[PDB]
Amino acid sequence: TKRGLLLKFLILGGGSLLTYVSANAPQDVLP
Amino acid sequence: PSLVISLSTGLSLFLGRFVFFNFQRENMAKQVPEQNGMSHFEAGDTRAKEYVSLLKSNDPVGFNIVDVLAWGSIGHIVAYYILATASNGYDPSFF
Amino acid sequence: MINLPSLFVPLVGLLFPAVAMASLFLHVEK
Amino acid sequence: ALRIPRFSQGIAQDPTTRRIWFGIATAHDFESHDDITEGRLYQNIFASHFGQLAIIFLWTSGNLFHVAWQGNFEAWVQDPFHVRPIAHAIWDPHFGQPAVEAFTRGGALGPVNNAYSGVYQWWYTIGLRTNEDLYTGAIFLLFLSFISLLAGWLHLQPKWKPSVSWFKNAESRLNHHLSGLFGVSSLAWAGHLVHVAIPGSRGEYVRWNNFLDVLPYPQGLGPLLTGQWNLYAQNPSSSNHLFGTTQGAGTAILTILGGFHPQTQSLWLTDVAHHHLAIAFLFLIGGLMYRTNFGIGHSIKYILEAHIPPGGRLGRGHKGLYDTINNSIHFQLGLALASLGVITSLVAQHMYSLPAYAFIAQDFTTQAALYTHHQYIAGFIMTGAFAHGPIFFIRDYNPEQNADNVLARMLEHKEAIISHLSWASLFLGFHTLGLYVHNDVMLAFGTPEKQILIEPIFAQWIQSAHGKTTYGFDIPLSSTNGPALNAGRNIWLPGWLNAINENSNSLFLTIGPGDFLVHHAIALGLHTTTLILVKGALDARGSKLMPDKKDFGYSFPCDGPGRGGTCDISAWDDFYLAVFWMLNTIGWVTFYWHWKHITLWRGNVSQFNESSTYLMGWLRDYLWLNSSQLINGITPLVCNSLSVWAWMFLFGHLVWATGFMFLISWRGYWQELIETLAWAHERTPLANLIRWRDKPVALSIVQARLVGLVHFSVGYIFTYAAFLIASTSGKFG
Amino acid sequence: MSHSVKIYDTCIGCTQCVRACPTDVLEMIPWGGCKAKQIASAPRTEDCVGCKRCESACPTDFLSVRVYLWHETTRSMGLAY
Amino acid sequence: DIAGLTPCKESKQFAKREKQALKKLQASLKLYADDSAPALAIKATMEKTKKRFDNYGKYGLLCGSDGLPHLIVSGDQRHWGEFITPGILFLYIAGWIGWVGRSYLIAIRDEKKPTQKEIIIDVPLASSLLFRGFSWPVAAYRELLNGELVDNNF
Numbered sequence A: 001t002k003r004g005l006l007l008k009f010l011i012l013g014g015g016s017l018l019t020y021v022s023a024n025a026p027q028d029v030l031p
Numbered sequence B: 001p002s003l004v005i006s007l008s009t010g011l012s013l014f015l016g017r018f019v020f021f022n023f024q025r026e027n028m029a030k031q032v033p034e035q036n037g038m039s040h041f042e043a044g045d046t047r048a049k050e051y052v053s054l055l056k057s058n059d060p061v062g063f064n065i066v067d068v069l070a071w072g073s074i075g076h077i078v079a080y081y082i083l084a085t086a087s088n089g090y091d092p093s094f095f
Numbered sequence C: 001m002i003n004l005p006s007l008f009v010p011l012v013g014l015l016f017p018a019v020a021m022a023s024l025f026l027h028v029e030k
Numbered sequence D: 001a002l003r004i005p006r007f008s009q010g011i012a013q014d015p016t017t018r019r020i021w022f023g024i025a026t027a028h029d030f031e032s033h034d035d036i037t038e039g040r041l042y043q044n045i046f047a048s049h050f051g052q053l054a055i056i057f058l059w060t061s062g063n064l065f066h067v068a069w070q071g072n073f074e075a076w077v078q079d080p081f082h083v084r085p086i087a088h089a090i091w092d093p094h095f096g097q098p099a100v101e102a103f104t105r106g107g108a109l110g111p112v113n114n115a116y117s118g119v120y121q122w123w124y125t126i127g128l129r130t131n132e133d134l135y136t137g138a139i140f141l142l143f144l145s146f147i148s149l150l151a152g153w154l155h156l157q158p159k160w161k162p163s164v165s166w167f168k169n170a171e172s173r174l175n176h177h178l179s180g181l182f183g184v185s186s187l188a189w190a191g192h193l194v195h196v197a198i199p200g201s202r203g204e205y206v207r208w209n210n211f212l213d214v215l216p217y218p219q220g221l222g223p224l225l226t227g228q229w230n231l232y233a234q235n236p237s238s239s240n241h242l243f244g245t246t247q248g249a250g251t252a253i254l255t256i257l258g259g260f261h262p263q264t265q266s267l268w269l270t271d272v273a274h275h276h277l278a279i280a281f282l283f284l285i286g287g288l289m290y291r292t293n294f295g296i297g298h299s300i301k302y303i304l305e306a307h308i309p310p311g312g313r314l315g316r317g318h319k320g321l322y323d324t325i326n327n328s329i330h331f332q333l334g335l336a337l338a339s340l341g342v343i344t345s346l347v348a349q350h351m352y353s354l355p356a357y358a359f360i361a362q363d364f365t366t367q368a369a370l371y372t373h374h375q376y377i378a379g380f381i382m383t384g385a386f387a388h389g390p391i392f393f394i395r396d397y398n399p400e401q402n403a404d405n406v407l408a409r410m411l412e413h414k415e416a417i418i419s420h421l422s423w424a425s426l427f428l429g430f431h432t433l434g435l436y437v438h439n440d441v442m443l444a445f446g447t448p449e450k451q452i453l454i455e456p457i458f459a460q461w462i463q464s465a466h467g468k469t470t471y472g473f474d475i476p477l478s479s480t481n482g483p484a485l486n487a488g489r490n491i492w493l494p495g496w497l498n499a500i501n502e503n504s505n506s507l508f509l510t511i512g513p514g515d516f517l518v519h520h521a522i523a524l525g526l527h528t529t530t531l532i533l534v535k536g537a538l539d540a541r542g543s544k545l546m547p548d549k550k551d552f553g554y555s556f557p558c559d560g561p562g563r564g565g566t567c568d569i570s571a572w573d574d575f576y577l578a579v580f581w582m583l584n585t586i587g588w589v590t591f592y593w594h595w596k597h598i599t600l601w602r603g604n605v606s607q608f609n610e611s612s613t614y615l616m617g618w619l620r621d622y623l624w625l626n627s628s629q630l631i632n633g634i635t636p637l638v639c640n641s642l643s644v645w646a647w648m649f650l651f652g653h654l655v656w657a658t659g660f661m662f663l664i665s666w667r668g669y670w671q672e673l674i675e676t677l678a679w680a681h682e683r684t685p686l687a688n689l690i691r692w693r694d695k696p697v698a699l700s701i702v703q704a705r706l707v708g709l710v711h712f713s714v715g716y717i718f719t720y721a722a723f724l725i726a727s728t729s730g731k732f733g
Numbered sequence E: 001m002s003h004s005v006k007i008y009d010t011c012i013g014c015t016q017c018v019r020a021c022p023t024d025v026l027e028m029i030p031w032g033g034c035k036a037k038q039i040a041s042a043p044r045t046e047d048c049v050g051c052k053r054c055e056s057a058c059p060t061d062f063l064s065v066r067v068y069l070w071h072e073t074t075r076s077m078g079l080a081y
Numbered sequence F: 001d002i003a004g005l006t007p008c009k010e011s012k013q014f015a016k017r018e019k020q021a022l023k024k025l026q027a028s029l030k031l032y033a034d035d036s037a038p039a040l041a042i043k044a045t046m047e048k049t050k051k052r053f054d055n056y057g058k059y060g061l062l063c064g065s066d067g068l069p070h071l072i073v074s075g076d077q078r079h080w081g082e083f084i085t086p087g088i089l090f091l092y093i094a095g096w097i098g099w100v101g102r103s104y105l106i107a108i109r110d111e112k113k114p115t116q117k118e119i120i121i122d123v124p125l126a127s128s129l130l131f132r133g134f135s136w137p138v139a140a141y142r143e144l145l146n147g148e149l150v151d152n153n154f
């Protein structure tokens, strides 16, 4: 609801934090 | 057994047939005719060919072979040297 | 820190795709 | 109803989905689509495949980059015993904890998949060794593969010319290439192997520091320029060698001497270099053959023109084949394809029996999934070769400009050409098939005797006039002596081309009636495959049923019913139809090696002998014997050794089968229920208003002949991919 | 082209010969002498789909038409819906 | 003689084939026909593949390993009629299939409406143009290449 130019922001942001820490982990619990 | 220098003698038989014309008439490259820039139409698809120009030195520079190829091959390349040898030079008969 | 080189399969096999399946929906429109 | 796709126009405002697909498959068809000029086009393929070379180095870079920090090398260069090298680390969150089970392979830590490409024995086989000494690869190749793009642009920018007419010379180029390129491209290679590699092979290292200080000898290039060459080849290598570490090394580059070794098969150190040298005169002597302004040599017409060997007095012309191979660009990309196609197999059929690498066959896997990615392709070419030489005939070509002229007459006297082709096949058909059912009716029937089985005489024959010093046999003038060579002897054919029978790796395997069939069934392939490609080609122009089949020639797939009933009668759909037999030859052939090899390794050879002379058995032992390993690899009893492969192998059987739809479906049925199935949405709540931007349709009437195929193919080619590997890996053999 | 498939012949007479084909072909345009004197190959073709019902009947003695149009609307394929 | 081994006069591997394999044909100690008059493995089927003893004729016949016999036919040592003898035979028989193909065909295209006389058959097999084939001495080997089917008609 300030949508006035966005979405590009939420697709680096949100999707670099559903995947940055989301894949990494400090002591596996492996594949 | 092998005349190895039978044929390196032999191949610079022919490319001295290359020492040719850098010298004798006019410029380079029968001066770039057509190379860069692109002869129209005639570079077009084509030209030239001439079954008639296999002469000129057939007779003269067919000697070029026997040059290096004689006295400068199996007969110890230029023994008549000396011309500044001290930062070294020699040069010395491996033969 | 210990044992952590896992980002070049989502950024590629996952997120790079996001970009283009989004982005390249430029074929539809832009 | 808007406007989009930025090159075509009919495609651009087509309201359906065709809009999309047909966009992503007209891209590369420059010659004639909106945006084009003979000036545009040429350059629009030029800075295209400068976009090439470019993608080949981002490939190679990473090939040398999943290797240098893991993926054994300061291992496998300690001694390369047939236990599981490495490509790269497999990493998928779907993996079970049997991440621990093989899949995870010995030396390295996390799971991996090992080099079945050769790279691993040529990054090594030209020296390139130490794991502190090694980590270059991308670093260069890539500080290269970017330049590959720079011209792309630089030569795309008008100003500093992208060159237009200059694209139809020849003479100048190819008077340049087969000297400048190849010749010095050799040479310079001859350079490298020799200063930096041969030393790295038999002898010792080369240190990143010195390059002057290192001298293959004590007293330099010595004579050499002194025409005296010979005394390279004396005590060059040895045999009590220990490959890579001198000691019985000796140091005199070049030879033809010594030969095979239980410690490495592979062409000798030197020879791949006097050769690389040796040929590098001929091309350099060859380069410098045509004009390029100065005023010597040749015009590429005037030695066609009225050249002609059996022409002269046989009323059969030769007019400007130049301004039609030159004004064609398809003739071009199809004499290009083939040569490559013929030599892609000459590469890959010589790459065995003569592999030039430190440990390869005596590897026997990488050796068998590398003859074929060079048999697939190669076959895969040939077709495309034959397929851009039936486009020349339609888009380009020019009956009034080629006539009485020997490219015509080829058209004109064509009905014969396919017939005396088809007569080969039908003969090569039932006659192979008599011999193979008969051979299979007789077994089963209890009589292994009665079996029809011709020795491959003219085969083994070629070889008892070589080195196949198999169990004696004279031959009138030869005997095994009296006359031997006389003119030849202790020079040339020394220990080499003297592998003989060598049950292990003799080069030539000892051929019998099992081979007098496959060898006539690879022959029934490229013949049938080509009656269709020769035909496909020999009238993309038209014929009786469709006389005026043109202005578009190639892919017009389909025509109305009536006349006789007319169908896959575009030169594409014969190409389309061709690719099945290029996928059936390039199967019988590859199929053949392996069964042979397999058997000729960790076991017998009698096996292929009395059990390839028939057909059932080709299915039973091979096909049915030798899958074993893989399939009980998902096993009700946990994931064992291989699992990628067998899942691939059933991914193999699906992608295949699911071709068929596309192939027995034909747009009509599909479109129509989509007519009913697009009465849904429109008539159903919580999914109304909701507009498509592309109108739901069923695939084009050419498109699906493709997609079933480009589907038929992967399945098929992804099945053997997984098959052979999944069985040449335990083996046994 | 945009619909360009040649059914032409030489008689272009249309009695017990050919009529079939959704809208596309409002001919009978007598060229000053061709026997039953009605001629050519089409009228305004920017209307209908891509049949070869076009020949199937009454000669084209050469080819006969089919799909070749490429540039292809929607009203030109039943399905723009 | 050539690549495989020698004929029947000796061929060890071949011998073993004769014996095990067939004779296990045996394999049925009895299986009742002590006197009985049907079940004929017993008599021939063996003996017809079998009394084919250390004789089969004698044929030469090369026999490789496993001793299944291979066919050279290069016209030498013994083996000539494993292709030519039954080769010219294939030629002669065919060609007198199609010599008459080009005959109960070139005899029709004439008279009055001749437009499918061929779905029925005028003289069955041709039984008129029949022997034209054995009644080929020379024949097409001249008259094909000179006249009739003459380059004209080419």
Ligand code: CLA
Pocket (backbone or CB within 6 Å): D056, D060, D117, D118, D119, D122, D184, D185, D188, D189, D340, D343, D344, D347, D351, D370, D374, D377
């Ligand atoms: C569609 C397929 C394609 C693919 C994916 C491959 C893949 C492969 N091929 Mg291959 N090949 C193909 C088509 C393909 N090929 C075709 C069509 C042919 C026939 C022409 C071949 C003939 C072929 C041969 C003979 C071999 C391979 C080999 C290989 C393997 C080696 C890796 C490699 O290629 O690095 C490629 C490396 C480069 C591109 C860089 C090297 C190029 C050098 C020569 C450039 C020299 C330029 C130099 C700078 C100029 C010097 C001038 C100055 C310094 C004086 C790899 C598996 C090799 C193998 O067997 O592995 C075991 C080898 O045997 N291929």
Ligand code: CLA
Pocket (backbone or CB within 6 Å): D024, D025, D026, D027, D028, D029, D030, D333, D337, D380, D381, D382, D383, D384, D385, D387, D391, D554, D555, D572, D706, D710, D714
């Ligand atoms: C080395 C290459 C060579 C070159 C330089 C060209 C160049 C060209 N070809 Mg061509 N071709 C070649 C080899 C080559 N070809 C071979 C070997 C074959 C068959 C053996 C063909 C069969 C072929 C056909 C049928 C046609 C061309 C056409 C063309 C022209 C347009 C290109 C195009 O349509 O692609 C655009 C394609 C795409 C953008 C991608 C769609 C391709 C699909 C089928 C994917 C293929 C399978 C794929 C690898 C599987 C999916 C991957 C999977 C792992 C998911 C262009 C002049 C066209 C033409 O202009 O002729 C009139 C067309 O008719 N070619």
Ligand code: CLA
Pocket (backbone or CB within 6 Å): D422, D425, D426, D427, D428, D429, D430, D431, D433, D524, D528, D531, D532, D577, D578, D580
């Ligand atoms: C295994 C398969 C099957 C068979 C038997 C054939 C056979 C043939 N294909 Mg073919 N084909 C196939 C699958 C098959 N195809 C598939 C899947 C495709 C791709 C979808 C193609 C695509 C293709 C193309 C493009 C062409 C062929 C051609 C041919 C013919 C080539 C000449 C030849 O090889 O010898 C002759 C035939 C054989 C050896 C097969 C046996 C035929 C005889 C022996 C029948 C047996 C008689 C029997 C006792 C009587 C039973 C009948 C009844 C009375 C009970 C041949 C008839 C070409 C052609 O037309 O050549 C002129 C060429 O056009 N094929």
Ligand code: CLA
Pocket (backbone or CB within 6 Å): D654, D657, D658, D659, D660, D661, D664, D665
């Ligand atoms: C192995 C086969 C292949 C597949 C997958 C299909 C699938 C289908 N065919 Mg079919 N068909 C085939 C070969 C195939 N066919 C062949 C060879 C022929 C003739 C020779 C036909 C003749 C035919 C006819 C006449 C009809 C069909 C119909 C159908 C549809 C039936 C409804 C259905 O259950 O689909 C959905 C289910 C599947 C396709 C199977 C599951 C697929 C798995 C692998 C799941 C993958 C999904 C997952 C999200 C993947 C995404 C991952 C990402 C990496 C992409 C279905 C799409 C009919 C139809 O349209 O009715 C609805 C119609 O009756 N077919």
Ligand code: CLA
Pocket (backbone or CB within 6 Å): D432, D433, D436, D518, D521, D524, D584, D587, D588, D591, D615, D618, D619, D620, D623, D624, D627, D631, D652, D653, D656, D715, D716, D717, D718, D719, D720, D721, D723
């Ligand atoms: C119910 C069936 C099913 C189906 C539909 C298939 C289908 C297929 N299998 Mg398959 N398979 C099956 C069950 C099935 N399999 C089972 C139960 C097993 C045992 C686990 C296998 C083991 C298997 C293996 C090991 C292979 C396949 C391959 C294939 C593919 C061959 C592709 C082709 O077009 O022909 C190509 C077929 C041939 C060229 C001939 C194979 C048939 C053999 C018996 C004869 C050899 C040809 C002969 C010697 C030369 C011609 C003689 C002639 C000139 C007279 C095909 C997709 C192969 C593949 O990857 O395809 C490339 C691979 O070889 N299968």
Ligand code: CLA
Pocket (backbone or CB within 6 Å): D419, D420, D422, D423, D426, D427, F097, F098, F099, F100, F101, F102, F103, F104, F105, F121, F123, F124, F125, F126
């Ligand atoms: C009387 C017979 C006749 C003759 C003289 C020929 C002759 C020829 N045919 Mg042919 N053909 C025939 C009948 C005949 N055919 C029939 C009935 C068919 C089935 C449609 C074909 C299908 C065929 C094909 C696909 C091809 C040929 C080709 C050829 C040529 C190559 C020969 C070859 O290798 O094929 C061997 C012959 C056959 C496969 C034909 C089988 C039919 C024979 C057995 C007919 C037997 C007589 C028959 C019963 C007539 C009744 C007798 C009557 C007097 C009462 C050659 C000119 C090839 C060509 O064009 O290259 C020049 C091409 O490959 N033929």
Ligand SMILES: CC1=C(C/C=C(\C)CCC[C@H](C)CCC[C@@H](C)CCCC(C)C)C(=O)c2ccccc2C1=O
Pocket (backbone or CB within 6 Å): D024, D661, D662, D663, D665, D666, D667, D668, D670, D671, D697, D698, D699, D700, D701, D704, D705
């Ligand atoms: C199923 C089927 C259809 C229907 C069309 C369908 C089913 C299209 C369905 C789309 C699928 C689900 C897309 C999945 C493909 C993915 C791999 C994505 C493709 C990405 C590309 C850009 C490469 C036809 O139109 C047709 C036409 C002519 C002959 C045979 C057939 C036929 O068999």
Ligand code: SF4
Pocket (backbone or CB within 6 Å): E007, E008, E009, E010, E011, E012, E013, E014, E017, E018, E038, E039, E040, E057, E058, E059, E060
């Ligand atoms: S009937 Fe067919 S002119 Fe005759 S072929 Fe042309 S439309 Fe009428």
Ligand code: SF4
Pocket (backbone or CB within 6 Å): E020, E021, E022, E023, E024, E025, E045, E048, E049, E050, E051, E052, E053, E054, E055, E065
């Ligand atoms: S042939 Fe074409 S123009 Fe004629 S009716 Fe059919 S679609 Fe219309």
